[PDB]
Structures are given as C-alpha cells and as structure tokens.
From a paper:
The second example we chose was a fusion of an artificial ankyrin protein (designed ankyrin repeat protein (DARPin)) and the protein A domain3. The DARPin protein, mbp3-16, had been previously selected by ribosome display from a large library of mutant ankyrin repeat proteins as a protein that binds to maltose-binding protein (MBP). The fusion helix was formed by superimposing 6 amino acids of the C- and N-terminal helices of the ankyrin and protein A domains, respectively. The crystal structure shows that the two helices were fused into a long continuous helix with nearly ideal helical geometry Figure 2 Fusions of DARPin-protein A, PKA_RIIα-protein A and PKA_RIIα-DHR14 by the shared helix method. (a) Crystal structure of the DARPin-protein A fusion protein. In comparison, the fusion proteins PKA_RIIα-protein A, MrsD-protein A and DARPin-protein A ligated by the shared helix method have negligible structural flexibility at the fusion sites.
Residue numbers in the entry: 13 to 209
The structure:
C-alpha cells in the first residue's frame, strides 16, 4: 500500500523513503478519509525538503482536509516560516479559510509568529473576520503581543483609502513612538478614515 507508506514517510520526515515511494508510482495526492495528504503531514511536521519534493511532483498545494485546513494553514499554525514561503511560492491561496473562517494569518497571529505574519502580508493576505468576527489584529490584542498589534495596525492604517499621506505617516510615526497605543491609534485612524469618506 504505497499511499499509506507515503503518508507515514511524509509525517516522519523520511526524505529518501518519500523519494523511493515516488519512484514506485505512489499517489502524491493520496488522502486519508480525513482529507489529509502527504503535503499536509509534511507541512505540519516541518519537513521542508519533503514539501519541496511533493510540490515538485504535483502535490495539490490547496488541498483541504475535512476541517478546511490547507497545508499553508498547518505551516502557519506550527510556525514553519520556510514552508510558508515555499507553499506561497508554489501558488497556495494566501486567503484560504478553514471550518471556522480562519485564514493562515489568523493562525500565525494566534501564536505570535511575527515573521510568518510578515511573509503572509507580503503575498497579499487579506484582513478577514473568523466565525467570532475577529481579525488578526483582534487576536493580537487579546494576547499581550505588542509587536504583532503594531505590525497589523501598521498594515491596516496603510490600506485606508481616505487618509492623506501626512495623516498616514503621522499614524505610522505614532506607531513607532509608543507601540502600546497601537490599538488606540488604529481606532483614531479609522474614525478619521470614516470622517473623510
């Protein structure tokens, strides 16, 4: 049973066993009844090289399990920066949502992965609300993570349509003087954004 062997080797990080299983015609996109594929297990376990091989042989980069998790979800949840970069480089939907409406940005913000949040925003990650109506910034505020709230408020302020350059740079400079106030400045910015619309 080559599919099961490929799933086991993908989860255990056995690179040469994955190569040999591929050489015998194992299905790159073999999924168990939960919808979990070898790319899922390699992105979850943190095996970058197996991610690169699987993607090289045609692994579905946007395969979702019965919970709605894509491999990008798993890489963001478990803090695998380089696997996030590799999956995005191979066309992963940066805005994929799970059963709870959560994007990889939500899961990366949940654990305070600053670099993964940066990489996701570089690839055009969108600000979305989960089932609880919460954004990645809200998650940043529920936790005591000042840096993450500062970055996410930087991006929210950066993308407001009705602020002019002097106001936007004033809010950004106000995000570098005291980051503890990142939650208040964004609200001030949003009020101004809606007064000039």
């Amino acid at each position: 049973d080559l599919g099961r062997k490929l799933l086991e080797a993908a989860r255990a990080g056995q690179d040469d066993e994955v190569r040999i299983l591929m050489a015998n015609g194992a299905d790159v996109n073999a999924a168990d009844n939960t919808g979990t594929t070898p790319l899922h297990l390699a992105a979850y376990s943190g095996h970058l090289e197996i991610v690169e091989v699987l993607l090289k042989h045609g692994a579905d980069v946007d395969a979702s399990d019965v919970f709605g998790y894509t491999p990008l979800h798993l890489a963001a949840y478990w803090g695998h920066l380089e696997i996030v970069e590799v999956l995005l480089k191979n066309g992963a939907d940066v805005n994929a949502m799970d059963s709870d409406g959560m994007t990889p940005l939500h899961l990366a913000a949940k654990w305070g992965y600053l670099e993964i949040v940066e990489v996701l925003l570089k690839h055009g990650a969108v600000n979305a609300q989960d089932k609880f109506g919460k954004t990645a910034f809200d998650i940043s505020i529920d936790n005591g993570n000042e840096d993450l709230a500062q970055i996410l408020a930087f991006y929210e302020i950066l993308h407001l349509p009705n602020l002019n350059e002097e106001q936007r740079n004033a809010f950004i400079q106000s995000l570098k003087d005291d980051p503890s106030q990142s939650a208040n400045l964004l609200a001030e910015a949003k009020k101004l954004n809606d007064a000039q619309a």
